[PDB]
Amino acid sequence: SLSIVRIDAEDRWSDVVIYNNTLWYTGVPENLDADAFEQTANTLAQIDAVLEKQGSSKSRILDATIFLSDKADFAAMNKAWDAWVVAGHAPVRCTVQAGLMNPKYKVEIKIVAAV
């Protein structure tokens, strides 16, 4: 559909937007003092739950942009990603180090997925 659907949840930093059978969402860490692996692993779990609640799923992710605050955390974030990603159904994947909006975020994950 060409009618935009927007979804706000109290426990969730980003809205979800659905349009033209496509879904956008940004995953942000919930446990600020946690390390990069935890934040990546738990943000990937957040994303699954958000996609499922709107019928989609981690199998239907088209493109993912992982922003990291520190180059030292690449290994940890690959380790989480690699434990979660669906073999043969993986999204196109962008990973860049950049400054994040909260100094305690080690990771932030933009998602575009099919609905």
Binding positions for a copy of itself, 58-77, rule CB under 8 A:
60, 62-63, 65, 67-68, 71, 74
Q: How many CB atoms lie within 10 A of CB 8?
A: 8
- Kindly state whether residue 34 participates in binding a copy of itself, applying the rule CB under 8 A: no
Smallest gap from Cβ 33 to a copy of itself, in A, equals: 20
Residue from 30, 96, 104, 106 binding a copy of itself (CB under 8 A): 96
- What is the pairing mode between strands 16-19 and 92-97? unpaired
- Kindly state whether residue 85 participates in binding a copy of itself, applying the rule CB under 8 A: yes
- Kindly state whether residue 25 participates in binding a copy of itself, applying the rule CB under 8 A: yes
Smallest gap from Cβ 29 to a copy of itself, in A, equals: 14
DSSP 10-32: TT-SS-EEEETTEEEEEE--S-T
- Kindly state whether residue 48 participates in binding a copy of itself, applying the rule CB under 8 A: no
CA angle 7, 13, 14 (to 5 degrees): 45
Instruction: Tell the burial category of 29 from Cβ atoms under 10 Å away from its Cβ (0-12, 13-18, 19+).
Output: buried
* Cβ–Cβ under 8 Å, residues 25 and 54: no
Binding site for a copy of itself (CB under 8 A): 2, 4, 6, 8-17, 19-22, 24-26, 60, 62-63, 65, 67-68, 71, 74, 81-82, 85, 87-101, 108, 110, 112, 114
